[PDB]
Amino acid sequence: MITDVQLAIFANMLGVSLFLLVVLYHYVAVNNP
Amino acid sequence: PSAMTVYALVVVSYFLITGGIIYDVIVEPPSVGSFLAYRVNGQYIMEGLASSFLFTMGGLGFIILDRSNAPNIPKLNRFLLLFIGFVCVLLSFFMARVFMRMKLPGYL
Amino acid sequence: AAMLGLMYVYWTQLNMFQTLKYLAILGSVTFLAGNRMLAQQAVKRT
Amino acid sequence: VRLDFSITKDPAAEARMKVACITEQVLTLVNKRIGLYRHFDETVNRYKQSRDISTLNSGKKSLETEHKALTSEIAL
Amino acid sequence: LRLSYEKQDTLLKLLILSMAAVLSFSTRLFAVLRFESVIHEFDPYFNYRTTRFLAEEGFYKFHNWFDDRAWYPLGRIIGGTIYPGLMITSAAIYHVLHFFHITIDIRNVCVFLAPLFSSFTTIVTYHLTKELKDAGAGLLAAAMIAVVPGYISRSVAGSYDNEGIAIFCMLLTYYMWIKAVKTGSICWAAKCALAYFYMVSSWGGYVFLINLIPLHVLVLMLTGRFSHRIYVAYCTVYCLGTILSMQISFVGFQPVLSSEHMAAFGVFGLCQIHAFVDYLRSKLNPQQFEVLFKISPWTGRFYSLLDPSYAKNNIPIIASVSEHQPTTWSSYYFDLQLLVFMFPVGLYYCFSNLSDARIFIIMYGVTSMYFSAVMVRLMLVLAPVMCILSGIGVSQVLSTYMKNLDISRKNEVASGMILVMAFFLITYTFHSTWVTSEAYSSPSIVLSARIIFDDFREAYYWLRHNTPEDAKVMSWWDYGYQITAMANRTILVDNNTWNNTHISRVGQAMASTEEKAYEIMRELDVSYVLVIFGGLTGYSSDDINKFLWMVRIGGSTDTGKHIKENDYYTPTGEFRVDREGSPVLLNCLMYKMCYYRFGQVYTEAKRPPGFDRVRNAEIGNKDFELDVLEEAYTTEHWLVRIYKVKDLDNRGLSRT
Amino acid sequence: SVVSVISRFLEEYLSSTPQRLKLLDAYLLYILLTGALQFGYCLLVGTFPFNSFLSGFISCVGSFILAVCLRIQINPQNKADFQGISPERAFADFLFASTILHLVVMNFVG
Numbered sequence A: 001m002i003t004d005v006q007l008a009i010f011a012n013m014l015g016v017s018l019f020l021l022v023v024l025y026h027y028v029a030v031n032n033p
Numbered sequence B: 001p002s003a004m005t006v007y008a009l010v011v012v013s014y015f016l017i018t019g020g021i022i023y024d025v026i027v028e029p030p031s032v033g034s035f036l037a038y039r040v041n042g043q044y045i046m047e048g049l050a051s052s053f054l055f056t057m058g059g060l061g062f063i064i065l066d067r068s069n070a071p072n073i074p075k076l077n078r079f080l081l082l083f084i085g086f087v088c089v090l091l092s093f094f095m096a097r098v099f100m101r102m103k104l105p106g107y108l
Numbered sequence C: 001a002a003m004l005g006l007m008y009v010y011w012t013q014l015n016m017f018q019t020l021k022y023l024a025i026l027g028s029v030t031f032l033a034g035n036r037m038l039a040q041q042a043v044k045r046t
Numbered sequence D: 001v002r003l004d005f006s007i008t009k010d011p012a013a014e015a016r017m018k019v020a021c022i023t024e025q026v027l028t029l030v031n032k033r034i035g036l037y038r039h040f041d042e043t044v045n046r047y048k049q050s051r052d053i054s055t056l057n058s059g060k061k062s063l064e065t066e067h068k069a070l071t072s073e074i075a076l
Numbered sequence E: 001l002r003l004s005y006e007k008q009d010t011l012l013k014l015l016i017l018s019m020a021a022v023l024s025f026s027t028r029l030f031a032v033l034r035f036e037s038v039i040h041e042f043d044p045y046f047n048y049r050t051t052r053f054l055a056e057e058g059f060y061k062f063h064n065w066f067d068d069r070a071w072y073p074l075g076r077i078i079g080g081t082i083y084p085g086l087m088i089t090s091a092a093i094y095h096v097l098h099f100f101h102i103t104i105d106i107r108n109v110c111v112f113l114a115p116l117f118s119s120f121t122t123i124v125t126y127h128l129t130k131e132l133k134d135a136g137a138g139l140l141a142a143a144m145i146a147v148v149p150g151y152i153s154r155s156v157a158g159s160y161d162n163e164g165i166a167i168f169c170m171l172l173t174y175y176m177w178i179k180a181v182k183t184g185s186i187c188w189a190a191k192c193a194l195a196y197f198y199m200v201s202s203w204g205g206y207v208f209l210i211n212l213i214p215l216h217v218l219v220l221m222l223t224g225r226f227s228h229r230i231y232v233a234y235c236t237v238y239c240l241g242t243i244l245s246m247q248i249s250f251v252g253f254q255p256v257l258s259s260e261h262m263a264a265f266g267v268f269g270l271c272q273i274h275a276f277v278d279y280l281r282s283k284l285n286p287q288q289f290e291v292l293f294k295i296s297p298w299t300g301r302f303y304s305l306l307d308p309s310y311a312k313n314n315i316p317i318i319a320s321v322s323e324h325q326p327t328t329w330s331s332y333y334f335d336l337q338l339l340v341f342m343f344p345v346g347l348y349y350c351f352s353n354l355s356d357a358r359i360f361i362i363m364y365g366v367t368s369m370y371f372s373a374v375m376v377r378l379m380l381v382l383a384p385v386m387c388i389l390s391g392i393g394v395s396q397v398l399s400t401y402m403k404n405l406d407i408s409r410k411n412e413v414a415s416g417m418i419l420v421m422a423f424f425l426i427t428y429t430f431h432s433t434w435v436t437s438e439a440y441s442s443p444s445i446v447l448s449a450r451i452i453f454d455d456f457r458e459a460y461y462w463l464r465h466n467t468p469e470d471a472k473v474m475s476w477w478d479y480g481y482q483i484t485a486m487a488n489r490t491i492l493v494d495n496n497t498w499n500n501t502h503i504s505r506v507g508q509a510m511a512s513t514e515e516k517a518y519e520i521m522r523e524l525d526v527s528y529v530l531v532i533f534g535g536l537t538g539y540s541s542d543d544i545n546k547f548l549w550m551v552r553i554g555g556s557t558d559t560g561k562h563i564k565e566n567d568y569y570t571p572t573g574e575f576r577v578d579r580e581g582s583p584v585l586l587n588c589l590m591y592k593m594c595y596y597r598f599g600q601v602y603t604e605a606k607r608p609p610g611f612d613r614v615r616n617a618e619i620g621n622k623d624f625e626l627d628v629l630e631e632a633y634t635t636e637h638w639l640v641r642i643y644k645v646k647d648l649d650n651r652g653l654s655r656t
Numbered sequence F: 001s002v003v004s005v006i007s008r009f010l011e012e013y014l015s016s017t018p019q020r021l022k023l024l025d026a027y028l029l030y031i032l033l034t035g036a037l038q039f040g041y042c043l044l045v046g047t048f049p050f051n052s053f054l055s056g057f058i059s060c061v062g063s064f065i066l067a068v069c070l071r072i073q074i075n076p077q078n079k080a081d082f083q084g085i086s087p088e089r090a091f092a093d094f095l096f097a098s099t100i101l102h103l104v105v106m107n108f109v110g
Ligand SMILES: CCCCCCCCCCCCCC(=O)O[C@H](COC(=O)CCCCCCCCCC)COP(=O)(O)OCC[N+](C)(C)C
Pocket: B001, B002, B003, B006, E218, E219, E222, E223, E351, E354, E359, E362, E363, E366, E367, E370
C-alpha cells in the first residue's frame, strides 16, 4: 500500500505549503485597490 | 468594568486554570517531586505554576508588542517597549518547548 | 390551502416519509407562486 | 447562476454592476489599443515605413479612440 | 498575463480551502494506513452493529427495536435508548452511494465517515470565522483546525463514535446562531432551529448548547445592547428547538421537566418581560410610568461537571473510567502546541472591538475552557473555539505588520515579525503531525508488540463458531459490545451501565467464593465465562487490575453486605498476589479463574516458574482445582480464558 | 386607583396604530385566549396525554411568537434595525417558520 514514512512527509509538506500560502494571502489582502 | 477589568479577570483566570488548579484540588500532589518522568498527564504544583506563567507571559508579550505599533509615540521609549515584547514572546515559546521535551522524552 | 390540508391528512393516514415528499412538492409550487406574487405586491406598494 | 428569485430589486446595487461591466470593457479596449499601437510602431517603423501602414494604424487608433469616447459618453 | 484583484483573491481562497480540506482528510487516516481497517476501542462496535441494522432492516423496524441479545435477564430497547443521528447519517450516505452503483460495504462507510465530517468541519469553521472578521482570519482558523491534535484524537479513521459528526453539528448550529444575531431574521432562526434539532439527535451535549445561547442572551441583556433582532432570533430558536428536541424518543419530556433546560425557559420569560416593559416605557410619560413602576433535579453526569467531587467520592461506576480526571498543563500543551499562546490575543481583539456576536464567542471560549479544566473528555469541545480565536489572533498580527512594509501599498521590524510568525506556524504543523503519528493512532483490539498477537479476536471467533446458538457468556461491562459484535452471543452486562443492580450482581459473582458465585451463576442461567488474563503478555489493562473496581461496585447494593472491600488487602493495607496475600483473595472465584495451571509456566529468564509479569510477583496458590468450572478454551498467549460453567452433580452430590 | 393611566394608554394606542397592526393585534389576542383556555382546562382535569397537551399548547405559543416577530419586522419604526428584511421577505419567513412549526406539532401530537 503506502508506507507511513510517505504519509507523514506528505502531510508535513502539505501543511507547510498551506500555512505559507495563507501568510501570502494576508499580504495580498492588505494591498487592495 | 468598562470591558478592561473583565479582560484582566479573564487573564488571571486563564493563568490559574492552565496551572492545573482543579487537578491539585481533586488529586493532591506533593509540591516538588523527590516533572513526572513518563506520565504525560501529571501535575506537580510548582511545575504547573511555572508553565501557566509562561503561557500568560507569551500572551502579554504579543499584546505588549501589538500595542507598540501605535503612532505618535516617543522613539526612545518605544524601542524599549519593542525589546520587552520580543524577549517575552521568544523566551516563552522556546522555554515551553524545552520543558515539554524534558518531561516527555522522545519528543519529535 | 392544499399544503395545510395535506398536513391534516398526514395525521390520519400517511407516514412521515410520504408526507414529507408531498410537502416538498407542494411547498416548491407554493414558493414559486409566492415569489411571483410578492414581487408584484412590492411593485404595487412602491 | 441564472435564477434571481428576488422580490425587492435594489437599483442602487444594480448601478454598481452596470458600472463594473463597463469599466472592464473599457480597460480591455484601452489595453488592447495600447498594445496594438506599440506593436504596429515596432513592426512597421524599423527602417522603412513609407507612411502607409502607419497611416492605417493611425486610422485604426482614431476609430478605437472614437469607440472609447462613445462608451465613455454612454457611461457618463 | 494579468488578472483582476477579485479573480486572484477568489483563486487564492479556493486553493487554500481545497488544500486545507484535503489535509484534514489526509491527516485523519494514520491507523488505516498501518493496521488493517477495523472499527476500534470497542465503544463503536455498538454503533457499528446499530448502523448495520439500520442499513439492512429499515427505519420503521429500527425506531421500535427490542434487543434480546444484551442484558439477558432484563430487556433493552435500542430504538429509544440512544441518540440515532450517527446511524441515520451513515445509512443515508450508504443508500446514496448504492443508488449510483458505487457499492461499498457498511463497514468501510462507518470507518471513513469521521474523516469526511472532519473535512466538512474546516469549511464550516472558515465561514464561522469569516462572520467574525476579515476572511484572512477565516482561512487561518480553517487551516489550524485542520491539524489540531485533540480533534484528530477523538476522530480517527476507524473510530466510529458520535463525537466526530457531533462537533460539525455544533459548529453549524453556532454559525446559524451568529448569522441570526447579526441578521436578525426569522429565516436564519428557523435554519438554526433545524440545525439544533440535528445536533440534539446526534450528541448528548445538546444540553450544553442550550445552556450557552440563553446565557449569552442574558449576558447581552446586562450589557444593555439588547435589540429587537436578538429578541426575534432567540425566541424563534427557543420554541422550535424545544419542540424539535422533544421528538427524539430518548429525550421524551426531558426539556420542559428536567433542570438542565431551565436556564433557557428563564431567559425566555425574562426576554418577554423586558420587551414588554421597553414597549410600555415609550407610550407613557415618565411620571406615569414611574407611578406604574414536580421538576427533576440534575441527572448527575452533568452535575459532576459543575462540582468535580461528587462522582469521584460517591458513585463508583462513573469515576471508574480512565479519562474522567482533571487535565494538567502538560496535557493542555500536548494537545495544543501554539493554540494556547494565542487564546489571550484572540480574547483581547474581541474585548477591544465589542460587537453583537463577539460577546457570544467570548462566552463560549470561557465556559468551554472551564469545562476542559474540569475533565479530560471535554478537551474536545475546547479545540474548536481555540482555533477560531487563535486564528483571529495570528491573523490580526499579520494584518498589522504586513501594512508597515515599504513594498506593501524602522520598517524591517515588521519583516522580522512576519518571519517569526511563519516559524511559529510551521513548527505548529510539525508538532501536530508528530503527535498524530506517534501517540493518537493505535488499535485497542490488537496489542502492538513488529509482531502482533490478536488473542481477543481469536477467542471471540472460537466463541462464535463452537458454542450452542443460545449460549450466554458473562464478562465485565468493558467487554460488552465487543463480544456481541464479534463473538455474537447473548451477554449479561454491557457498556451502557443503565442498571447498576445488574452490574453489582455480576461483580458479586466475580468477587465471592465458588459456592456463592456458583449459586449466582446458576440463578442467572450463565454458561460460559470470559476473563482476560494478560499475565504472560504483560498487558497492564487486564481483568485483574479491575478486580478492585468489581469489588467496590458489587459490595454496594443491599446484597453485598458481606463483600467488605477491606477484606482483600494485607494486614498493613497492601494488595499482593503472593503468599502474603489475603486468604480470601487467594480463594476468590476471580483468583481461581485466570490462574488455573498457571503455576508451572516459565515466563522469564532469571525468575521462578509461577511468575506474573504485570504484577511482578509469585502466585500464592500454585496448584488448585476448579470444582464448578471446566476450561473451555485459552488463547495462544493465555490472554483470554473461557470457562464452561458446570451442571448439578448427577448423583446429587455436594460439589462445593 | 390605576384606571386613569389605563384609559389614557388605551386611547393613545389606537391613534398611533395603523389598520394592519390593529388587525394583527386582534389575531394575537385570539391566540392568547385560546392558549389560556387550553392551559386552564389542563389545570382543571390533569395531564394523562401529556404529549398531546404539550403539542396543542406549544402550537399556540409558537403561533403567538411568530405573530409578534412578524409585527416587529413590519412596523416601519424599526426599518433601521433590519436593513434588507423587506415586508414581503418578512411575510415569507413567517410562512416558512409557521409551516415547520405546524408540521412538528402534528408529528408530536397523538
Ligand atoms: C462556571 C462557569 C461560569 C461561566 C461564566 C461566564 C463568564 C463570562 C465572561 C465575561 C463576558 C464578557 C462580556 C463583556 O464583554 O461585557 C463587557 C463588560 O461589561 C460586563 O460584562 C459587566 C457585566 C458582568 C457580567 C459578566 C457575565 C455574567 C453572567 C452571569 C449570568 C462590556 O463592557 P460595557 O462597559 O458594559 O459595554 C461597552 C461600553 N464601553 C463604552 C466600555 C465600550
